[PDB]
Structure of PKHD-type hydroxylase TPA1:
Amino acid sequence: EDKIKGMFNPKIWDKTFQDGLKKEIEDSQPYNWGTIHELVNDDLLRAVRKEIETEIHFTKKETDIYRVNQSGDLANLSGLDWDDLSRLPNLFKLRQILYSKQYRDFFGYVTKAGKLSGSKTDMSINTYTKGCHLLTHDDVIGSRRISFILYLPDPDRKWKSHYGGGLRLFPSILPNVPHSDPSAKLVPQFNQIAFFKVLPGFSFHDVEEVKVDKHRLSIQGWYHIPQVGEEGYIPGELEDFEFPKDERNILSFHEVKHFEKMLKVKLSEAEFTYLSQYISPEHLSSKGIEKLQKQFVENSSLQIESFLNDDKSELLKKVIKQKELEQECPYHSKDVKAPWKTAIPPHKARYLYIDGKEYRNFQTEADILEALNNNDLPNFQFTKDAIKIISDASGNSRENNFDAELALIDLAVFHKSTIFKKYLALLTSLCPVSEQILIRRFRPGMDFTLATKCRFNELLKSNPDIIDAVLEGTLCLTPSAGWESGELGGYELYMMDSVLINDPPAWNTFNLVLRDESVLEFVKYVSWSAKSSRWDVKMKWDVKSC
Ligand SMILES: O=C(O)CNC(=O)C(=O)O
Ligand SMILES: [Mn+2]
């Protein structure tokens, strides 16, 4: 109770230091946070790190939102018991002082956070190694009031920026709508502490993938609202911003009646000729269709390899490989030009896409609000029009050309066709009544989606003929190697609310799934070390039975 303050850098007890830091936090951007260098008695934090290395057993865990080496899974034996620190006397001593009344009075003062629990200790020990990463979130959970992270990388070697592993902070386009791109990045050093008041809809942050083979050791923790009466405490003393929307447009009367008349290999020579512009002969033949109809009835899932025929396989691979290798892919949302859009918000997803709508770039509230007041629909042929006219001005350089976008839009127009939707209904024996089609590109080190359910159309809920499901399709057009372990991410993951599908990115595949209310999907975050983007074509349809 006396030697506590002495286990800190004496500067934090200095009134001048305190009042100076308080203001630094008040006026910080993009939301109120702060950092202190050399927080703790160096020989202690050195003792603590030698303890963690000696005694604690880290276990990789990957989910949609992170990959991190964890020590916290209790009910795994290796799980760290904070109720038993017999062999981590210096860690015990660390927790004691971070939650001391001495430190809490300081730390609460500078952060204008009010009272902070000393009895509700809440700490965890993680390492991030090559590939590890934690996507965007605001920390808003239960009674967390202030977040803090104490860094213990190798104390005798400075952590470098190109290592990755940075604390990134996202600014607010408007509340619960953080800008896709981070506006500040903290390269952590030993005995450094990052911290912020937990703020619903604002404190969005992440941990940049660790790119090299080093060990980023941290102690994340939280200060909580006091227990009721603790040191005198008394209590009390959006889908509209998601882009793309998970919406489909109903099909014409022409289209639907076709799929009905058919279901109540009945395609013409002509229709088969159309379908074979794009689809491999192997999936147009009688045997090949019975083979797929059977699969679908059994699994309510198709996973087709070599979907497209070789003419279109060679074409797409070429133009996709050309763009990968000879053009500057944009790595900030401001840089994305027509026909591409950046999916937002980053605590839900981040990827590049073509939706055939008029061009949006969302840097401001007014950008989001201008689009909401002016909802507009896809038109791919007009999108092609727009591109050629831009692509004539500049000149179709090895570096500036739109060949990929044009081949892919052509592929989307195929899949938009009446006839494909006939072929589809033939495969599945379902009548599509709606569609949404997207071209998606997931960039190394930036793009991901997160585990979500399908979204039923509210207007068609009361319809007995429409299946309480969503038919979802994914044509993957990723031409690079090394995805196969999951290690690079990019994989399409279908699981239940146990895993239905787990397909790393591959070339010219087509997955097809009928999702009921409860199925979760996500494309995993793509590693910085991936050798290309994941390219694909996402297709969603409401369906009805015939
Ligand atoms: O280690 C870091 O810098 C960030 N950690 C977190 O944001 C978290 O654990 O929720
Ligand atoms: Mn966090």
Remarks:
- Residues 238-546 form a domain with the Double-stranded beta-helix fold (CATH 3.60.130.20).
- The CA atoms of residues 126 and 159 lie 16 Å apart.
- The chain has twelve helices and 29 strands.
- Residues 134, 139, 149, 167, 205, 207, 218, 220 surround N-oxalylglycine (ligand 1) (CB under 6 Å).
